[PDB]
Design a binder for these strands. Structure first.
Lengths: 354, 150, 352, 351, 153
DNA sequence: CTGTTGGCAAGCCAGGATCTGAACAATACCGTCATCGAGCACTGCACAGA
DNA sequence: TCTGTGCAGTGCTCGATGTTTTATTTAT
RNA sequence: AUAAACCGACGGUAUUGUUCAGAUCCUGGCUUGCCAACAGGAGUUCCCCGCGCCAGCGGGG
């Protein structure tokens, strides 16, 4: 099968894991009721900035709109390998912007960069210089082998997972990436009416009253996390990697989706809870189990137990309803192979679900 | 019969820090109905008359961006909201489209975000008149004023 | 029964499956209430570009306005079967445009093309000039057996289903196709006030704040999908295919209408939800069930259950009031009842 | 009574059923507010070109007209302008015990009589006459085999009818259909993705569309229908009328239906006999406001309007109503029909 | 399908001193389902219908604060509970918040104490409707009427 | 068979700052005037003679 | 007893062509 | 039978790809719910039946 679906139910103690410009919890209406929400971009950054990512996958991408600051970073990191003039020219050709000595050079938008990828481009720009090859003709010939370029995304796997957009430069032809990972905004399986914490700040030099009064919205919740990985797209985005390496990467995402939690407000709320349930299945078609909670789960000795019930029940309805026979395994603390430990589930995924 | 826009503007300006903070933390116009400080602010401007209620919710919710975000400036019609947002030179035209296309409550939320960003200098009683009706005509004139300025 | 009506209720988690010029969710007023909308053209393109279509139906058509680029594609694809001269004239006659070596040659409008259909045409063109038969009379001859042309649409079924028009070239006379499938815009059974996501883009070289602040509309929704297939028209559009051939194609549409979801914003919202109810009904006149939701569905343990219930109640009202007795079957996860979609599909394959 | 009034309330999902030369939805101002409109001619053609019409009207039994059986009454009708020599010569060359005769039949034959009368005077016959009147003869022969269609809808846009009596109006009159409520139309902003183009689409456009609860009105002139059927009976005319009731409830114009698919049947159908045919459009002159949809308040506004004006407007007479809804009913003077077929039978049985 | 509020008000005012005293003795509305005199009172007001009974529990529990506590009056809108509590001038705004923020059964206890404290002159059927739909909308309008009336004086 | 009453419900003071809000490419075509005569089609026409 | 080349007889589609068009542009 | 009558404005079409809202913060000090009180009065219970001193005692419902 090409798609690996990942399902996570994870319960959080009272907290504010993701908020907006008014410091209100992000939410969403589903089933006609308010669900507290953690956005997909919050989860993705939490993962790519995590220690686990750094130890098991590598360095995350460099995302910036500031080309002048980027110019200086590249001049230092690639200064021993390439002349400053070709480092500049390379960045200029990629971004479509002029790179001089100006203190402020802006890209069109925040762009994901991989230093190794730019380094690769430097080798091509240098060679074109030595062959007196036109800039327009360099673009043409490099366009004929995208895979060679995508090999460098092994130094920036988060791009291969989540994609890259480009509106200016050679990147509009050479740097377009269709992300291999699809991921949903996490939402609570149940209705939530968030709590409000009314706080003070006591001023040690002020005896009458406090120096500041304020409020902070928070709530607990059982969240459903969904994501899938297009294994073919992942292999292609990595320049032609094997299924093994794609499964290796997919397994790491499984781990992170079960353990990684956004750092927002955790210093003062500390909702450091691991997943209570992880479900992984292979399929020919991406499949979300969100409609298990279309009808808001109601509390019955917690939300967690009825949520896993609703998940399993709906899973069974869809499995034989649509005749889905792809490999499936399940791990929980409370046909589908049961796994006592997360580690056994992870090895199961690495072995292509066998 | 008509809401005294400048009186309300002054009342909001010399509001105590407490009452002001209680109003500002609102996330949408209807939540002002939960705030006691809100009722006391708009009571002398005809709140108990249902005719004025939706207008007063819009007016105060726009003000609630902050005491110093909307700067009233007297006529020399006077600077409209559309011209004032363009005068800032901070607002992309795309965000104006998204504003004038938005449906109820969501429009006021997006407007207040724009006021926060733009910090406009305008004719406040003129903007209040616009907030009173807020029909499809007013929303198109907002966009066209913005474009005619840039 | 000549018509196969297809009814789908499908629920999506928060997403943005179809948006307009300002990147806001498409919508529509129905029953005085805003419904989130997915255009029929979005549905049709999601189906024709899908893996299922490729495996079970074949190749989707080539839709383009760039004849110079098309010219080069045909030369590479029909080169070992015809000489470059014949390929160029064929495109020229069909499009009504001068096919030379220009870098940019543009058609009147975007037009769907079928390679197999073009291949069939250049045979005729070759035989035409061989028999010293000019173009004016070639057209007169080809107009006499359009069915022989339509057999090529078995290589481009999405045209047989969705249609084609042209205003210049021989395609004006020979390529006029009235699609066999009718399909509505998907609308939510209930009122939706869309959500707004306030997002940031954190810059790794910017320690203070973020480099971009923005907003993105999104929502959930239980959608009603409707489509019907004109079997007799589908047979005619395929050059005189059998009813079994039309029925099998209809069955794939049923499957796709229940499972295919547009790809827009799915990389960051992942609403990969299959349908919770599918209903197929044979009739003499097309029958949409949309008025089951004219009174917008109020939530009651979700929108899905009361939507399906509203659908069932209105179905009975119409059947009892209009005395309708065409064959009908219903698959659901929440009239002949089908436990699985596969049984439902066998049913359709077997003429109900 | 001589007139059958047919009232339909039909709800359409998002669509563009009828548009103008700018591709904008047709509309109308009613009660000072914009209503989406489906034109009379659009609605009538949807009926006249439908399959149901072709089977029940196009293939009727009264369809065919036999010039042979009409010889006697034609002989006395044209007998004062023409003598039996020409009248019988004409009657036979057109074809190669009837009581009455359809007006356009008399008039068109009388024209042919004028031609052959002038043919004998100018002293030409054989093929020369049948060469000159070749197309004209072919025309009337076709029309003589479409008598019910002509009696119901009137003559076609190309008929070959020659005289003033040949200006044949339909016995049914179809009004423009308008929404009961005010409508601000939606806009669909669309793309066309080019399979050979990398950046962006090859075309962009907009299309206006909307939903709408429409009011359809039609009346049938029975005497006119009978008179244009060679003197058919009330029962035979009521049988035709049953088909009109059915079509006004079920037939929808095909425009844009391939891509919007608004295939909705009527939710309310009412028929009433009167001496003076009246539209009940002023039930919605004050535009219906939405309350859990537009459909329920529209049927409600239709019922309340009937209760208020029917008596004073002289809408005493047989009245029946079919409805998919359980909205509070009209006055008990209107007989409730649970199915459409029961309503249609009620029409056949003269009410 | 609505409870005759004025009839229930009259039924309580005319009720024998012994039966109404048995009712007042209750400490929380759910305890009224154990008192025989309670069913004796609310029987001609559709206690049989499960929808009516939760409202009937609230209405009687408020009526059971005393018998003379809630002086009903007639419209000249009609005085709402929010206006009435503010009209007494005995209730401060923080106690109003403790009503509209209180959880289940706790809210009715607080309301009871407030009625006893304020002894309000109001429109009883108007109040009865509020207790029937004791929702977020009723809490919000309650605070509105209180704040405006207080601020006016 | 019979169930109560008075008197009473607080005040002070306090609500923040920083900084940030994108870019590209693409919007269609046809027919709904007329004239003249010619070159070239259905289409019946009887037949003459097969 | 049917059918064949000439018609007479005309139903046409063919193409070049008669004419003729332009008016504006905020508010600051 | 009204500038009427007869009478479609029609056909084709993804709006797409990228994105933490984030860092800091006691709601806090003071306060009886209190004074008076037999659960006692009042034999209706509508029948069938068996034995009496006619007062009243029993078994079946």
């Amino acid at each position: 099968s090409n798609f690996i679906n990942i399902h996570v139910l994870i319960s959080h103690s009272p907290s504010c894991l993701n908020r907006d410009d008014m410091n209100m919890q992000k939410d969403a209406i589903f089933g006609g009721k308010r669900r507290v929400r953690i956005s997909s971009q919050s989860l993705k950054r939490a993962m790519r900035k995590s220690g686990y990512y750094a130890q098991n996958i590598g360095e995350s991408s460099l995302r910036t709109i500031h080309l002048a600051q980027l110019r200086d970073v590249l001049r230092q990191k690639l200064g021993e390998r390439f002349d400053q003039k070709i480092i500049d020219k390379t960045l200029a050709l990629l971004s479509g912007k002029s790179v001089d000595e100006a203190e402020k050079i802006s890209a069109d938008a925040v762009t994901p960069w991989v230093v190794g990828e730019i380094a690769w481009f430097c080798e091509q720009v240098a060679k074109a210089e030595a062959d007196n090859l036109d800039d327009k003709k360099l673009l043409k010939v490099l366009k004929e082998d995208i895979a060679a370029i995508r090999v460098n995304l092994q130094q920036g796997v988060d791009i291969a997972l989540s994609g890259r957009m480009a509106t200016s430069g050679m990147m509009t032809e050479l740097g377009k990436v269709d992300g291999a990972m699809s991921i949903a905004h996490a939402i609570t399986t149940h209705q939530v009416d968030s709590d409000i914490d009314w706080f003070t700040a006591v001023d040690d030099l002020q005896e009458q009253g406090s120096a500041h009064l304020g409020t902070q919205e928070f709530s607990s919740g059982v969240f459903y996390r969904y994501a899938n990985i297009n294994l073919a797209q992942l292999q292609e985005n990595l320049g032609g990697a094997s299924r093994e390496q794609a499964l290796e990467i997919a397994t790491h995402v499984v781990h992170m989706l079960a353990t990684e939690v956004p750092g927002a407000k955790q210093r003062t709320y500390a909702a450091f809870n691991p997943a209570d349930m992880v479900m992984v299945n292979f399929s020919d078609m991406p499949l979300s189990m969100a409609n298990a909670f279309e009808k808001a789960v109601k509390a019955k000795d917690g939300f967690l137990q009825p949520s896993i019930q609703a998940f399993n029940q709906y899973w069974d309805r869809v499995a034989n309803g649509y005749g889905l026979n792809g490999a499936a395994a399940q791990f929980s603390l409370s046909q589908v192979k049961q796994m006592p430990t997360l580690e056994q589930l992870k090895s199961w995924v690495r072995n292509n679900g066998e | 019969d008509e809401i005294d826009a400048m009186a309300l503007y002054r009342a909001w300006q010399q509001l105590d820090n407490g009452s002001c903070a209680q109003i500002r933390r609102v996330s949408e116009p209807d939540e002002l109905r939960d705030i006691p400080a809100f009722y006391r602010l708009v009571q002398p401007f005809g709140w108990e008359n249902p005719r004025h209620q939706q207008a007063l919710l819009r007016m105060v919710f726009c003000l609630s961006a902050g005491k110093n975000v909307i700067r009233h400036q007297d006529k020399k019609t006077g600077i409209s909201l559309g011209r004032a947002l363009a005068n800032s030179g901070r607002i992309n035209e795309r965000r104006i489209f998204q504003l004038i296309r938005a449906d109820r409550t969501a429009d006021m939320v997006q407007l207040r975000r724009l006021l926060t960003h733009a910090e406009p200098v305008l004719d406040w009683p003129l903007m209040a008149r616009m907030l009173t009706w807020w029909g499809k005509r007013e929303r198109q004139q907002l966009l066209e004023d913005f474009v005619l300025t840039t």
